[PDB]
Amino acid sequence: TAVPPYRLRVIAEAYATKGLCLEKLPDREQDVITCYEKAGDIALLYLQEIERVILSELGFFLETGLQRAHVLYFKNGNLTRGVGRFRELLRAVETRTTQNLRMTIARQLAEILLRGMCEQSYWNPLEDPARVYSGENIFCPQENTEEALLLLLISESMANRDAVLSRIPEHKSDRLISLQSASVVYDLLTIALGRRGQYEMLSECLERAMKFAFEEFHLWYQFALSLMAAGKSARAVKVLKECIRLKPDDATIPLLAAKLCMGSLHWLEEAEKFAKTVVDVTSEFKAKGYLALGLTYSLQATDASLRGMQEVLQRKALLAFQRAHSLSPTDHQAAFYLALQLAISRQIPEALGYVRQALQLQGDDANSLHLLALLLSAQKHYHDALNIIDMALSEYPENFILLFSKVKLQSLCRGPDEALLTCKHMLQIWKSCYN
Amino acid sequence: GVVEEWLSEFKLPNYATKSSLVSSLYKVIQEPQSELLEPVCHQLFEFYRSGEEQLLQFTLQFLPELIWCYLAVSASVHSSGCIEALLLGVYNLEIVDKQGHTKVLSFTIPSLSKPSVYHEPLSKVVYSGPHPQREMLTAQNRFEVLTFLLLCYNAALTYMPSVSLQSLCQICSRICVCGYPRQHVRKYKGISSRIPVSSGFMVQMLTGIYFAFYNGEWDLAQKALDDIIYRAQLELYPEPLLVANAIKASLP
């Protein structure tokens, strides 16, 4: 206090000269550590004084002499000292001229606070493991996720206003740096937030970041995936189509688009187009495309209105299914779907053989057992189907369709009392499962 | 047979703090062809009554190896069925047995508009719990308790040595590729079957693997990540694919 600035300048020059002299030569180590500590203290005093005087341009020696200190601390392994120093750095009053460096340290903290400790390895800063902001309305950090999200949110909010708006008049370096910083901070945010199973705010954040992306595949793909995972459909389909337009190289994107089209949205032509695009372009992907095309053909055949086209679409679906099975004989789903499609044409022995092979590949599928029981029902063997349904119920004692099949089979085979008991048990189960 | 002498001398709080006890346990647990598996598992479960963490953390790190061994041998063969007892008991004690009440994991969402400790110009969200107590294992709720136990194991990552991380990465590499030609490409030999994994289990698997990336293990973690992304792409699972894609573009 009350010290002329030239004394500060000359002592800073002396500190720089001592730092240069110490490294250029091949206990005193404690003296060096204390010199670094007093350099940090005088740096804190300098920043407090400058923020005071501005409150009412070349930082060349302080930055290195302060950062390489904790760099060497991390190299040796003094993690506690470094994190405490960071905690006391973040407690300083904000300065508008230093905001950029703030970004750095904030991001650096977000890099270390998620990969260097556990819950039981956390301690309050007031105990060992001038003006300072305080009060009771301040948000005291509780868990790592809390403060990590807070730091990421403030960093994103402060970095949105510092964007270059893709000026691109003749130069590109500044925009590239800004885009890289935005990409890394948003990747950190999405990896931090996606672990908890919270997706909609991730979609909102990617929508906010959508301003930068003009011809970037990564941001469009991330936004599309987040939107589709959130639950929305139409926007997901549109962004999937745009991504397909951007780079026609992969087959996962059209496959996901076809799956969404075939889902609850209940569209068929777009699924056909996506399947045809997939099949136009290893060997697994074309098999999956054939399977999707066959499923689409079957769904179209189900909702027909006249005679001939039903048989035409059934034959097309059967051909697609058999082609898919031929291209890959080591997948139970294709065999099961082939058996299910073949059972429609009433050709019983062939469908029975195919479903037997599918069970041979894997016999834990509830749908496979249900189809086996349903097929045995057509051959007039009620006790065998009853036992199959009983075993399936034993494996899955909380399903619904199997219960309906059991009720129908009991009504057709045993009597009404068993059906009444099963119905009352089903009512009890439904009452227990809900409120 | 040092474990036999340890059991004999066992049947006060300073029992733990052996240099090669973990090596002996891994040696006797790496194969199912042992004769003292049942008493040693009884001792494993008995290591959990005490409330001190120095025993719980000392016994927790062995779960992935026995989980893989049990889930692979059974899905083929004699099955002991007593490991499921230990799994169910630890699930029950981690879901109810804290003070008599269940666990409801929750936190808050910070808001920028409200002045904060670091800056000036929140509803509780539950991600785990309550989970009803489970006493039998079936083919419908097994993956739920597996994911919950994996999440419990993913809470003290600093304490376990590098051997546990290497074993976890080795199991993760081949757990999700066992039933596809890719494992033939990677030249893996063993049971040629497949396991119907769930999305949440893979998400917790990604969370576990991401920590070991910068702790010495580099190539193994990268191969495990490649296997995870390939399996997710083939199975059409959105969230693990998104997490893996985010992780991929954040490597120097």
XYZ file of C-alpha atoms in Angstrom:
687
model
C 0.000 0.000 0.000
C 1.096 3.564 -0.820
C 3.939 2.186 -2.957
C 4.936 3.939 -6.198
C 4.464 1.753 -9.291
C 8.124 1.875 -10.355
C 9.092 -0.086 -7.238
C 6.607 -2.761 -8.312
C 8.142 -2.702 -11.797
C 11.707 -3.090 -10.525
C 10.796 -5.888 -8.111
C 8.963 -7.681 -10.938
C 12.078 -7.312 -13.097
C 14.171 -8.707 -10.235
C 11.786 -11.665 -9.923
C 12.063 -12.338 -13.661
C 15.864 -12.107 -13.523
C 16.006 -14.515 -10.575
C 13.719 -16.935 -12.404
C 15.945 -16.773 -15.477
C 19.107 -17.283 -13.410
C 17.781 -20.221 -11.373
C 16.865 -22.329 -14.414
C 20.080 -21.582 -16.341
C 22.281 -23.374 -13.782
C 22.708 -27.140 -13.160
C 17.358 -26.230 1.559
C 17.443 -23.762 -1.340
C 14.506 -25.630 -2.893
C 12.312 -24.412 -0.027
C 13.594 -20.903 -0.747
C 12.482 -21.332 -4.370
C 9.034 -22.525 -3.266
C 8.669 -19.547 -0.917
C 9.786 -17.210 -3.713
C 7.030 -18.643 -5.908
C 4.529 -18.199 -3.067
C 5.485 -14.551 -2.556
C 5.349 -14.026 -6.327
C 1.783 -15.328 -6.249
C 0.962 -13.057 -3.313
C 2.373 -9.974 -5.044
C 0.466 -11.006 -8.181
C -2.747 -11.062 -6.143
C -1.894 -7.629 -4.741
C -1.144 -6.311 -8.243
C -4.426 -7.574 -9.682
C -6.364 -6.165 -6.723
C -4.671 -2.778 -7.153
C -5.274 -2.645 -10.911
C -8.931 -3.643 -10.579
C -9.296 -0.998 -7.856
C -7.754 1.764 -9.970
C -9.766 0.855 -13.072
C -12.919 0.595 -10.943
C -12.403 4.132 -9.570
C -1.009 -4.007 -21.898
C 1.580 -6.774 -22.348
C 1.554 -9.464 -19.678
C 4.772 -11.331 -20.433
C 6.402 -12.406 -17.144
C 3.559 -12.862 -14.642
C 1.635 -15.362 -16.779
C 4.499 -17.827 -17.241
C 5.911 -17.352 -13.737
C 2.487 -18.131 -12.254
C 1.248 -20.901 -14.568
C 4.427 -22.985 -14.816
C 4.410 -23.081 -11.002
C 1.264 -25.201 -10.831
C 2.346 -26.979 -14.026
C 5.402 -28.226 -12.125
C 3.185 -28.930 -9.107
C 1.068 -31.221 -11.293
C 4.232 -32.778 -12.736
C 5.486 -33.657 -9.251
C 2.024 -34.664 -8.048
C 1.027 -31.993 -5.489
C -2.628 -32.180 -6.471
C -4.013 -30.797 -3.196
C -1.888 -27.643 -3.327
C -2.826 -27.037 -6.957
C -6.558 -27.478 -6.438
C -6.452 -25.224 -3.367
C -4.601 -22.587 -5.379
C -7.248 -22.864 -8.099
C -10.023 -22.519 -5.512
C -8.468 -19.343 -4.114
C -7.871 -18.037 -7.646
C -11.552 -18.423 -8.550
C -12.558 -16.436 -5.440
C -11.046 -13.204 -6.788
C -13.164 -10.327 -8.072
C -13.811 -10.608 -11.803
C -11.886 -8.377 -14.210
C -13.184 -7.570 -17.688
C -9.681 -7.535 -19.197
C -8.843 -11.017 -17.849
C -12.053 -12.778 -18.939
C -10.198 -14.796 -21.584
C -7.755 -16.290 -19.083
C -10.741 -16.957 -16.829
C -12.141 -19.166 -19.601
C -8.928 -21.169 -19.606
C -8.754 -21.795 -15.876
C -12.479 -22.500 -15.684
C -12.220 -25.064 -18.465
C -9.063 -26.449 -16.875
C -10.976 -26.970 -13.642
C -13.744 -28.716 -15.578
C -11.023 -30.956 -17.002
C -9.597 -31.957 -13.618
C -12.616 -31.950 -11.278
C -14.247 -34.776 -13.283
C -11.235 -37.101 -13.591
C -9.086 -36.761 -10.469
C -11.153 -37.541 -7.378
C -14.213 -39.335 -5.999
C -17.035 -38.394 -3.634
C -15.186 -39.381 -0.450
C -12.060 -37.545 -1.688
C -13.839 -34.169 -1.485
C -13.352 -31.693 1.356
C -14.630 -28.265 2.322
C -12.143 -25.459 1.520
C -12.235 -24.185 5.127
C -10.167 -27.118 6.454
C -7.251 -29.250 5.334
C -8.056 -32.606 3.633
C -8.401 -8.238 0.900
C -12.096 -8.286 0.012
C -13.490 -11.759 -0.712
C -16.995 -12.556 -1.941
C -19.192 -13.980 0.819
C -22.763 -14.000 2.115
C -25.585 -16.417 2.816
C -27.510 -16.235 -0.480
C -24.476 -17.502 -2.417
C -24.747 -20.964 -3.981
C -22.454 -23.226 -1.977
C -21.262 -26.173 -4.106
C -22.472 -29.560 -2.876
C -21.386 -32.237 -5.372
C -18.942 -32.391 -8.264
C -21.749 -32.442 -10.838
C -23.341 -29.305 -9.360
C -20.291 -27.044 -9.564
C -19.177 -28.649 -12.837
C -22.511 -27.795 -14.460
C -22.365 -24.292 -12.972
C -18.885 -23.661 -14.386
C -19.803 -25.082 -17.795
C -22.970 -22.968 -17.919
C -21.175 -19.737 -17.039
C -18.378 -20.533 -19.505
C -20.848 -21.175 -22.335
C -22.837 -18.033 -21.499
C -19.681 -15.897 -21.463
C -18.321 -17.518 -24.648
C -21.522 -16.999 -26.657
C -21.088 -13.210 -26.540
C -17.409 -13.461 -27.560
C -18.131 -15.347 -30.794
C -16.698 -13.948 -34.026
C -20.069 -14.429 -35.813
C -18.136 -16.161 -38.634
C -16.914 -12.856 -40.042
C -14.862 -14.627 -42.780
C -14.122 -11.498 -44.888
C -10.682 -12.745 -45.947
C -9.180 -14.391 -42.823
C -10.068 -17.704 -41.193
C -7.767 -18.321 -38.199
C -9.809 -16.447 -35.583
C -13.045 -18.158 -36.612
C -11.300 -21.541 -36.541
C -10.049 -20.897 -32.999
C -13.513 -19.780 -31.878
C -15.139 -22.838 -33.466
C -12.628 -25.168 -31.808
C -13.247 -23.581 -28.402
C -17.022 -23.799 -28.842
C -16.786 -27.422 -29.976
C -14.648 -28.485 -27.022
C -16.774 -26.663 -24.439
C -20.014 -28.088 -25.847
C -18.512 -31.587 -25.978
C -17.546 -31.245 -22.316
C -21.060 -30.029 -21.498
C -22.776 -32.892 -23.324
C -20.537 -35.575 -21.817
C -21.107 -34.092 -18.352
C -24.888 -33.863 -18.754
C -25.664 -37.036 -20.723
C -24.532 -39.338 -17.916
C -27.538 -38.508 -15.714
C -30.097 -39.336 -18.413
C -31.173 -35.722 -18.942
C -31.547 -35.060 -22.672
C -33.965 -32.190 -23.352
C -31.683 -29.467 -21.990
C -28.915 -31.013 -24.101
C -31.173 -30.561 -27.132
C -31.766 -26.951 -26.064
C -28.027 -26.296 -25.687
C -27.287 -27.797 -29.101
C -30.071 -25.641 -30.560
C -28.385 -22.618 -28.977
C -25.016 -23.661 -30.437
C -26.606 -24.280 -33.867
C -25.655 -20.727 -34.911
C -22.042 -21.619 -35.731
C -22.631 -24.743 -37.823
C -22.872 -24.069 -41.562
C -21.087 -27.013 -43.229
C -19.999 -29.092 -40.218
C -21.094 -32.722 -39.994
C -20.262 -33.134 -36.302
C -22.622 -30.507 -34.870
C -25.522 -31.496 -37.135
C -25.076 -35.167 -36.234
C -24.904 -34.453 -32.498
C -28.005 -32.249 -32.640
C -29.938 -34.853 -34.637
C -28.983 -37.668 -32.264
C -29.898 -35.594 -29.203
C -33.260 -34.611 -30.705
C -34.091 -38.207 -31.617
C -33.106 -39.422 -28.144
C -35.237 -36.713 -26.509
C -38.448 -37.977 -28.107
C -39.277 -35.523 -30.879
C -39.710 -37.107 -34.307
C -40.375 -34.657 -37.154
C -37.389 -32.431 -36.377
C -35.223 -35.527 -35.942
C -36.307 -36.812 -39.363
C -35.629 -33.447 -41.013
C -32.151 -33.129 -39.502
C -31.445 -36.755 -40.463
C -32.377 -35.899 -44.051
C -30.113 -32.843 -43.978
C -27.216 -34.917 -42.617
C -27.806 -37.478 -45.376
C -27.643 -34.642 -47.904
C -24.413 -33.363 -46.340
C -22.327 -36.559 -46.591
C -23.672 -39.634 -48.456
C -21.068 -42.078 -47.152
C -22.431 -43.993 -44.149
C -25.423 -46.310 -43.815
C -26.236 -45.825 -40.118
C -27.986 -42.494 -40.744
C -30.488 -43.770 -43.369
C -31.083 -46.874 -41.244
C -31.978 -44.725 -38.230
C -34.174 -42.548 -40.444
C -36.006 -45.637 -41.715
C -36.424 -46.938 -38.162
C -37.948 -43.630 -37.057
C -40.211 -43.545 -40.120
C -41.402 -47.115 -39.466
C -42.041 -46.372 -35.775
C -45.012 -44.779 -34.048
C -45.110 -42.005 -36.667
C -46.515 -44.694 -39.008
C -45.077 -43.616 -42.351
C -44.154 -46.113 -45.052
C -42.925 -44.413 -48.239
C -39.986 -42.702 -46.526
C -38.944 -46.004 -44.942
C -39.021 -47.576 -48.406
C -36.864 -44.778 -49.818
C -34.333 -45.079 -46.990
C -34.170 -48.872 -47.339
C -33.627 -48.565 -51.096
C -30.873 -46.006 -50.500
C -29.200 -48.354 -48.007
C -29.394 -51.355 -50.335
C -28.092 -49.283 -53.262
C -24.740 -48.801 -51.511
C -19.771 -54.447 -45.842
C -22.351 -57.245 -45.890
C -24.210 -56.747 -42.612
C -25.552 -53.329 -43.632
C -27.149 -54.585 -46.848
C -28.683 -57.493 -44.920
C -30.203 -55.020 -42.455
C -31.479 -52.946 -45.371
C -33.112 -56.020 -46.898
C -34.698 -56.846 -43.535
C -36.072 -53.308 -43.223
C -37.424 -53.414 -46.780
C -39.150 -56.718 -46.064
C -40.696 -55.384 -42.861
C -41.950 -52.315 -44.731
C -43.444 -54.538 -47.438
C -45.187 -56.672 -44.808
C -46.611 -53.590 -43.083
C -47.864 -52.262 -46.425
C -49.440 -55.648 -47.174
C -51.249 -55.649 -43.824
C -53.065 -52.372 -44.595
C -54.124 -53.226 -48.153
C -57.678 -53.065 -49.513
C -57.976 -55.623 -52.348
C -56.873 -59.169 -53.201
C -53.981 -59.355 -55.655
C -51.579 -56.777 -54.245
C -51.752 -58.559 -50.882
C -50.263 -61.716 -52.399
C -47.812 -59.647 -54.458
C -46.487 -57.852 -51.375
C -46.394 -61.092 -49.377
C -44.264 -62.700 -52.094
C -41.983 -59.652 -52.211
C -41.562 -59.735 -48.426
C -40.825 -63.468 -48.493
C -38.216 -62.959 -51.220
C -36.574 -60.137 -49.263
C -36.545 -62.213 -46.068
C -35.012 -65.247 -47.777
C -32.391 -63.061 -49.472
C -31.491 -61.524 -46.107
C -31.259 -64.976 -44.522
C -29.023 -66.190 -47.358
C -26.707 -63.183 -47.034
C -26.248 -63.825 -43.296
C -27.070 -67.155 -41.590
C -25.901 -66.177 -38.071
C -28.710 -63.931 -36.792
C -31.775 -65.262 -34.989
C -33.918 -62.178 -35.637
C -33.935 -62.724 -39.405
C -34.921 -66.384 -39.029
C -37.660 -65.525 -36.526
C -39.117 -62.852 -38.804
C -38.915 -65.222 -41.780
C -40.852 -67.854 -39.832
C -43.443 -65.277 -38.762
C -43.933 -64.081 -42.345
C -44.133 -67.648 -43.663
C -46.760 -68.597 -41.070
C -49.129 -66.062 -42.660
C -49.316 -68.122 -45.870
C -50.532 -71.109 -43.755
C -47.480 -73.173 -44.827
C -47.093 -74.788 -41.413
C -44.216 -77.333 -41.655
C -41.735 -74.940 -43.278
C -42.466 -72.151 -40.795
C -42.180 -74.672 -37.961
C -38.762 -75.762 -39.209
C -37.561 -72.176 -39.588
C -38.750 -71.175 -36.114
C -37.143 -74.343 -34.734
C -33.845 -73.243 -36.285
C -34.319 -69.753 -34.830
C -34.902 -71.270 -31.384
C -31.765 -73.350 -31.941
C -29.775 -70.155 -32.502
C -31.335 -68.576 -29.392
C -34.137 -69.851 -27.179
C -34.541 -67.074 -24.598
C -36.685 -64.848 -26.837
C -40.194 -64.388 -25.457
C -41.536 -63.685 -28.948
C -40.037 -66.956 -30.199
C -41.754 -68.985 -27.472
C -45.038 -67.155 -28.056
C -44.859 -67.879 -31.789
C -44.033 -71.531 -31.087
C -47.068 -71.881 -28.819
C -49.298 -70.091 -31.334
C -48.093 -72.392 -34.119
C -48.618 -75.522 -32.013
C -52.150 -74.250 -31.389
C -52.909 -74.541 -35.114
C -51.890 -78.228 -35.056
C -54.489 -79.079 -32.360
C -52.094 -79.813 -29.483
C -53.506 -77.796 -26.597
C -51.577 -79.295 -23.667
C -48.173 -78.661 -25.262
C -49.067 -75.039 -26.017
C -50.398 -74.679 -22.471
C -47.097 -75.918 -21.031
C -45.119 -73.606 -23.332
C -47.204 -70.608 -22.251
C -46.795 -71.678 -18.620
C -43.002 -71.759 -18.951
C -43.020 -68.383 -20.719
C -45.122 -66.953 -17.877
C -42.654 -68.425 -15.391
C -39.810 -66.667 -17.199
C -41.750 -63.377 -17.557
C -44.353 -63.178 -14.762
C -45.341 -59.567 -15.593
C -46.192 -59.632 -19.316
C -49.678 -59.059 -20.752
C -50.038 -60.696 -24.182
C -48.957 -64.097 -22.863
C -51.617 -63.783 -20.157
C -54.303 -63.157 -22.788
C -53.143 -66.187 -24.772
C -53.199 -68.293 -21.599
C -56.733 -67.108 -20.797
C -57.964 -67.978 -24.288
C -56.293 -71.402 -24.262
C -57.671 -72.205 -20.799
C -61.164 -71.174 -21.900
C -60.833 -73.434 -24.946
C -59.283 -76.413 -23.116
C -59.803 -76.634 -19.340
C -62.849 -74.651 -18.232
C -64.291 -71.317 -17.112
C -63.095 -71.418 -13.496
C -59.419 -71.327 -14.485
C -60.132 -68.400 -16.812
C -61.885 -66.539 -13.986
C -58.952 -67.157 -11.637
C -56.465 -65.970 -14.262
C -58.548 -62.854 -14.938
C -58.739 -61.949 -11.246
C -54.989 -62.527 -10.895
C -54.433 -60.240 -13.892
C -56.621 -57.565 -12.291
C -54.632 -57.877 -9.057
C -51.342 -57.567 -10.963
C -52.569 -54.485 -12.829
C -53.740 -52.890 -9.575
C -50.377 -53.589 -7.929
C -48.375 -52.259 -10.888
C -50.182 -48.886 -10.943
C -51.837 -46.513 -8.482
C -2.567 -72.309 -0.434
C -1.869 -69.113 1.496
C -5.617 -68.426 1.519
C -6.093 -71.609 3.555
C -3.667 -70.341 6.205
C -5.381 -66.938 6.151
C -8.758 -68.587 6.767
C -7.286 -70.770 9.523
C -5.742 -67.791 11.328
C -8.890 -65.698 10.823
C -11.287 -68.098 12.559
C -9.207 -56.626 15.683
C -9.949 -53.754 13.232
C -6.301 -53.877 12.058
C -6.692 -57.173 10.172
C -6.027 -55.537 6.797
C -3.748 -52.603 7.635
C -1.014 -58.077 2.577
C 1.211 -57.519 -0.454
C 0.219 -60.623 -2.446
C -3.260 -61.374 -1.072
C -4.934 -59.766 -4.097
C -2.714 -61.782 -6.446
C -3.676 -65.014 -4.676
C -7.369 -64.089 -4.806
C -7.128 -63.376 -8.539
C -5.259 -66.654 -9.056
C -7.932 -68.664 -7.239
C -10.845 -66.752 -8.830
C -9.631 -66.627 -12.452
C -10.970 -70.163 -12.989
C -14.141 -71.949 -11.829
C -12.328 -75.270 -11.226
C -11.670 -74.778 -7.517
C -12.744 -76.627 -4.380
C -12.876 -73.790 -1.813
C -15.010 -71.396 -3.885
C -17.973 -71.674 -1.510
C -16.176 -71.001 1.827
C -14.107 -68.227 0.264
C -17.281 -66.609 -1.103
C -18.811 -66.934 2.365
C -15.798 -65.032 3.708
C -16.162 -62.483 0.896
C -19.751 -61.800 1.957
C -18.738 -61.723 5.635
C -16.249 -58.968 4.758
C -19.254 -56.618 4.350
C -20.954 -56.551 7.774
C -18.402 -54.115 9.201
C -19.052 -50.429 8.600
C -15.453 -49.394 7.949
C -14.598 -48.592 4.338
C -11.130 -50.191 4.455
C -12.729 -53.641 4.002
C -15.591 -52.748 1.651
C -13.175 -51.035 -0.738
C -10.691 -53.891 -0.287
C -13.317 -56.441 -1.372
C -15.291 -54.422 -3.945
C -12.787 -54.481 -6.820
C -13.178 -58.225 -7.504
C -16.737 -57.948 -8.847
C -16.099 -57.599 -12.628
C -14.058 -60.804 -12.941
C -16.529 -63.051 -11.121
C -19.444 -61.318 -12.865
C -17.940 -62.103 -16.271
C -17.050 -65.665 -15.271
C -20.511 -66.429 -13.878
C -22.362 -64.789 -16.772
C -20.244 -66.604 -19.377
C -20.064 -70.089 -17.835
C -23.786 -70.236 -17.027
C -24.795 -68.994 -20.500
C -23.562 -72.099 -22.297
C -22.577 -77.025 -17.230
C -22.639 -76.990 -13.432
C -23.752 -73.729 -11.814
C -23.125 -73.037 -8.132
C -25.767 -70.325 -7.810
C -24.263 -68.944 -4.592
C -22.591 -65.965 -6.288
C -26.100 -64.678 -7.020
C -26.658 -64.748 -3.259
C -23.713 -62.385 -2.736
C -24.892 -60.141 -5.582
C -28.450 -59.963 -4.234
C -27.234 -59.332 -0.683
C -24.933 -56.487 -1.688
C -27.743 -55.021 -3.810
C -30.109 -55.184 -0.830
C -27.606 -53.616 1.567
C -26.803 -50.862 -0.952
C -30.474 -50.100 -1.679
C -32.057 -50.225 1.821
C -29.485 -50.864 4.563
C -28.183 -47.418 5.431
C -30.310 -46.398 8.446
C -33.670 -48.081 7.762
C -34.685 -45.925 4.773
C -34.195 -46.311 1.034
C -31.959 -44.258 -1.272
C -33.311 -41.490 -3.520
C -30.384 -40.012 -5.446
C -31.022 -36.424 -6.518
C -29.351 -33.062 -7.082
C -30.141 -29.523 -8.247
C -29.726 -27.628 -11.520
C -27.798 -24.338 -11.122
C -29.303 -21.269 -12.783
C -27.331 -18.396 -14.293
C -30.086 -15.828 -13.689
C -29.904 -16.245 -9.916
C -26.675 -14.697 -8.559
C -24.088 -17.366 -7.784
C -21.002 -17.620 -5.596
C -18.698 -17.036 -8.592
C -20.967 -14.858 -10.753
C -23.780 -12.327 -10.475
C -25.981 -10.920 -13.284
C -32.888 -25.835 -9.104
C -35.721 -28.351 -8.868
C -34.777 -31.748 -7.467
C -34.242 -34.375 -10.176
C -34.046 -38.070 -9.276
C -31.890 -40.348 -11.428
C -31.748 -43.436 -9.182
C -34.139 -44.874 -6.625
C -36.319 -45.986 -5.154
C -35.623 -49.592 -6.164
C -37.829 -52.349 -4.693
C -35.962 -55.062 -2.821
C -34.986 -58.041 -4.978
C -34.607 -61.588 -3.686
C -34.626 -63.719 -6.860
C -32.869 -63.358 -10.213
C -34.781 -63.823 -13.477
C -34.226 -63.032 -17.161
C -36.012 -59.663 -16.924
C -34.557 -57.739 -13.953
C -30.976 -59.060 -14.037
C -29.619 -56.177 -16.117
C -31.226 -53.583 -13.833
C -29.428 -54.864 -10.736
C -26.249 -55.356 -12.778
C -26.359 -51.698 -13.850
C -27.061 -50.567 -10.283
C -24.142 -52.599 -8.912
C -21.856 -51.256 -11.647
C -22.902 -47.715 -10.718
C -22.091 -48.514 -7.085
C -18.670 -49.842 -8.135
C -18.081 -46.659 -10.170
C -18.057 -44.486 -7.029
C -14.499 -44.981 -5.671
C -12.351 -45.114 -8.808
C -9.198 -43.719 -7.173
C -8.544 -46.499 -4.658
C -8.313 -49.595 -6.864
C -4.921 -50.470 -8.403
C -4.169 -50.749 -12.111
C -4.772 -54.521 -12.193
C -8.492 -54.010 -11.575
C -8.681 -51.431 -14.370
C -6.856 -53.769 -16.759
C -9.220 -56.628 -15.902
C -12.247 -54.364 -16.357
C -11.007 -53.184 -19.754
C -10.255 -56.756 -20.858
C -13.764 -57.866 -19.888
C -15.320 -54.818 -21.563
C -13.433 -55.498 -24.801
C -14.956 -58.947 -25.367
C -18.262 -58.731 -23.472
C -20.074 -56.907 -26.295
C -18.437 -58.629 -29.287
C -18.721 -62.280 -28.254
C -21.389 -63.105 -30.843
C -20.176 -61.413 -34.024
C -17.431 -62.017 -36.617
C -15.530 -59.028 -35.205
C -14.334 -61.193 -32.310
C -13.109 -63.718 -34.881
C -11.186 -60.837 -36.460
C -9.733 -59.954 -33.046
C -8.853 -63.649 -32.487
C -10.757 -64.358 -29.276
C -11.404 -67.949 -28.197
C -14.034 -69.199 -25.770
C -17.834 -69.307 -25.684
C -19.319 -68.440 -29.086
C -22.601 -66.951 -27.886
C -24.189 -63.509 -27.496
C -25.539 -61.487 -24.577
C -28.543 -59.091 -24.875
C -27.112 -56.047 -23.105
C -29.110 -52.909 -22.286
C -28.520 -49.231 -22.993
C -27.995 -48.096 -19.401
C -25.435 -50.830 -18.781
C -23.436 -49.645 -21.799
C -23.700 -46.018 -20.651
C -22.272 -46.950 -17.248
C -19.638 -49.001 -19.094
C -18.623 -45.899 -21.060
C -18.488 -43.882 -17.840
C -16.204 -46.507 -16.321
C -13.905 -46.792 -19.332
C -13.492 -43.034 -19.835
C -11.619 -42.640 -16.533
C -8.953 -45.250 -17.360
C -8.030 -43.544 -20.648
C -5.521 -41.170 -19.013
C -4.281 -43.559 -16.292
C -1.663 -45.484 -18.260
C -4.004 -47.819 -20.134
C -4.261 -46.280 -23.614
C -4.425 -48.930 -26.359
C -6.750 -51.249 -24.427
C -9.170 -48.408 -23.678
C -9.120 -47.291 -27.317
C -9.899 -50.815 -28.533
C -12.690 -51.141 -25.964
C -14.157 -47.832 -27.151
C -14.013 -49.049 -30.756
C -15.817 -52.249 -29.765
C -18.452 -50.256 -27.862
C -19.131 -47.898 -30.761
C -19.273 -50.782 -33.254
C -21.735 -52.718 -31.090
C -23.905 -49.645 -30.491
C -23.927 -48.802 -34.206
C -24.961 -52.361 -35.058
C -27.638 -52.474 -32.328
C -28.973 -48.927 -32.981
C -28.624 -47.566 -29.443
C -28.690 -43.741 -29.421
C -27.270 -42.654 -26.068
C -24.079 -44.788 -25.897
C -23.394 -43.844 -29.515
C -23.731 -40.147 -28.659
C -21.456 -40.463 -25.628
C -18.817 -42.408 -27.573
C -18.923 -39.906 -30.442
C -18.459 -37.050 -27.968
C -15.518 -38.846 -26.340
C -13.861 -39.622 -29.685
C -13.503 -35.976 -30.761
C -11.922 -34.930 -27.435
C -8.540 -36.650 -27.699
C -5.206 -34.838 -28.353
